[PDB]
Design a protein around this ligand. Structure first.
Ligand SMILES: [Cu+2]
Ligand SMILES: [Cu+2]
Ligand SMILES: [Cu+2]
Lengths: 279, 284
């Protein structure tokens, strides 16, 4: 509407973006998203399972799609010419990026302050955070490249190879699904790849599911994911969401995605939700 | 005004059978879990963050949040069987009993009885005995059996009485600044029951004990709904005499008349009139 390459934004656009987020934060609306996100990771389908309402199963993409939309709509309610932009990490793949500049996301974590980010719009003291329980946490943390599993960001080819996969998702609709676009993008096939890998590479809150959205980068990242998925939906036009049925409740096409009543089907056609990327 | 909520002791065996069945259905379908989860997610959402007030307790939204919660539940009951409604457990009358555990709410055909001391107070009678009914912990993780321990703690040796109810109905204000546990002369704070507590709502939870004894795991017990119905009923009666809400403004965001009550967009205002949500209580 359009969701643009974060690398293509003007210095006004970058600034207005940050501005808005921080307003969403002042009003108390931003915490709803953090918590909602936390709620869903705790909602396992069925209880005891690996899968939750937002990750490690089919609902992953529609959930985060519905997550971003609500979010964008809220930015719109503050400043209508703002759209959720996206961080094309595949061509970033790693900190020599403009995204981490002082004016935008801020930089990596301070190893001397326990990796609390001490620069950028959301450094500690300028930006409060909440832990997995929903109590004050002490600040945004980040640790680029720290773990052996995710020393680098996914490359272009990784992205192109995922887009070749013929089916949206396959039984048993979890992190072991094979030839599954969903599982490849999320990044569980020879993980961490793609989505899981970006998460492990950033570190800090972004490094753990129920705290990830404390980092505004979450939205630039999840926007890039959503984009890859929309692209895949443009490729495989003969293919649709799965499962349609006989998935765990919350994962099927016409199930409500906890914490909402929104279902995958409601979000299956992103243009319908009223926005596009840089084609 | 068409849905009617009846006093539990007034349900025939057949209505009790049906309500139990509808519940087990919400359970197997995986719908009932959304309720336990939402309830837990709310308690961990502080307004403001760090505050002792959460989106559903320890503050003004307590009654509205719980009525909205019941209304969504009943509606899910309704999508299975549109003749079923939320009953209420009039605990202040069972109080009167020499021994409330013998209250017919606890019979094997409805809620089930008291925990078994030898089996660590896991309930082993009724529709929701250990094995027939599963539970989750406050973290969204697998738990064990349903447990009950009627009137165990010294804090709540007894079920709140008629006079307790009657006396809370005398309260003139809905709630008072600073909109919390310390709010004085507040119907909301009174009914919730922590202040000058345990009484009423809090006391009931403590009286039952087991999962009901702790807030974030309480919806694991079906009676959670029967008791909060009685709570809705009582606030309904209050509202019959008093017929609305504070804080209207100014309060912590999520507590005011027109604020959304996490995890939803529903406001306290949306639920101020119960009749006009589609239900009345038998005694209406
Ligand atoms: Cu996520
Ligand atoms: Cu993520
Ligand atoms: Cu409660």
């Amino acid at each position: 509407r359009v969701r643009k390459n974060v690398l293509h934004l003007t210095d006004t656009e970058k600034r207005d973006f940050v501005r808005t987020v921080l307003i969403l934060k002042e009003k108390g609306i931003y915490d709803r998203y953090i918590a909602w996100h936390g709620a869903a990771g705790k909602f396992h389908t069925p209880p005891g399972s690996d899968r939750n309402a937002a990750h490690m199963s089919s609902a992953f993409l529609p959930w985060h799609r519905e997550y971003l939309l609500r979010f964008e709509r809220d930015l719109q309610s503050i400043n209508p010419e703002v759209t959720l932009p996206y961080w094309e990490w595949e061509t970033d793949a790693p900190s020599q990026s403009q995204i981490w500049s002082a004016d935008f996301m801020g930089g990596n974590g301070n190893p001397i302050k326990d990796f609390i980010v001490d620069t950028g719009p959301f450094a500690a003291g300028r930006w409060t955070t909440i832990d997995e329980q929903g109590n004050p946490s002490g600040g945004l943390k980040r640790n680029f490249g720290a773990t052996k599993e995710a020393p680098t960001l996914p490359t272009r080819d990784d992205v192109l190879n995922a887009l070749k996969i013929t089916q949206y998702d396959t039984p048993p609709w979890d992190m072991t699904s094979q030839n599954s676009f969903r599982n490849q993008l999320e990044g569980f096939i020879n993980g961490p790849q793609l989505h899981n890998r970006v998460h492990r590479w950033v570190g800090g809150q972004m490094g753990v599911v129920p705290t990830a959205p404390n980092d505004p980068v979450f939205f630039l990242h999840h926007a890039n994911v959503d984009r890859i998925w929309a692209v895949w939906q443009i490729i495989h036009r003969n293919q649709n969401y799965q499962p349609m049925k006989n998935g765990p409740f919350g994962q099927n096409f016409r199930d409500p995605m906890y914490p909402w009543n929104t279902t995958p089907e409601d979000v299956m056609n992103h243009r319908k939700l009223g926005y596009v990327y840089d084609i």
